[PDB]
């Protein structure tokens, strides 16, 4: 049975998500336009930079997150950002044509589009397989927003000072997610669903690592760095 504390956590994360993920993708118009080598880099760099800001806005409204130090907030978001971007992207991802469909054909991104931003298939092929497996989980929105929040508040991230407080915050969230699955997720959909969600967090670490590797290559060349945003340069280094 879902406690009062737990119901409140869910209502807050749902609202936090509704406030930071616009499913009409209205802002995409403000990005440097798409072009179909590094042809898609200006558009996707802007997209990612925007999405970083949205993730920060989401994170801020996570119950317990405000209690963390500024430094701890920084290290959690710096290491989580790419992963949460990949998680939140599942909402626009469609298995029909293995694409992110963000409202229009201009903002509909397939394997070849997202490969035109300096990243190879060593990231994109596993990213796309991740999106398929995650989509097959058929998560309730409540589960989706809990998983993103759990991903952000991970005690093992490099450079974390107050790991025990980070763990305490995450546990509250984990326990909520587990209880929610038990109470509100009907079998068979619910079968080992928690274990499968936590596995997605493992997959994301692997994707983050590969993204890091390729970001270093991309960004070693100043003419490519030039095409990013200052936020992207700060967050990804």
């Amino acid at each position: 049975k879902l406690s009062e504390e737990q119901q409140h956590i869910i209502a807050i994360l749902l609202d936090a998500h509704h406030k930071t993920y616009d499913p009409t993708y209205a802002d995409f118009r403000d990005f440097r336009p798409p072009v179909r080598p590094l042809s898609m880099l200006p558009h996707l760099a802007d997209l990612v930079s925007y999405s970083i800001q949205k993730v920060i806005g989401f994170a801020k409204m996570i119950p317990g997150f405000r209690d963390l130090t500024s430094d701890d907030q920084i290290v959690l978001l710096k290491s989580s950002a790419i992963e949460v971007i990949m998680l939140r992207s599942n909402q626009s991802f469609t298995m029909d044509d293995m694409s992110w469909d963000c409202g229009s054909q201009d903002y509909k991104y397939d394997v070849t589009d997202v490969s035109k931003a300096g990243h190879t298939l060593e990231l994109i092929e596993p990213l796309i397989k991740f999106q398929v497996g995650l989509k097959k989980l058929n998560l309730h929105e409540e589960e989706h927003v809990l998983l993103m929040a759990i991903c952000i508040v991970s005690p093992d991230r490099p450079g974390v000072q107050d790991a025990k407080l980070v763990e305490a915050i995450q546990d509250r969230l984990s326990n909520t997610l587990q209880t929610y699955i038990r109470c509100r997720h009907p079998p068979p959909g619910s079968h080992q669903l928690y274990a499968k969600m936590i596995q997605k967090l493992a997959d994301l670490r692997s994707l983050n690592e590969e993204h890091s590797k390729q970001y270093r290559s991309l960004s070693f060349q100043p003419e490519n760095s030039m095409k990013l945003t200052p936020l992207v340069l700060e967050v990804f280094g």
């Binding site: 806005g57 978001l77 200052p230 936020l231 700060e234």
Partner: peptide, 10 residues
């Protein structure tokens, strides 16, 4: 060491 990130978090 991350001014923009800090600004957006405060």
């Amino acid at each position: 060491n991350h001014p923009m990130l800090m600004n957006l978090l405060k």
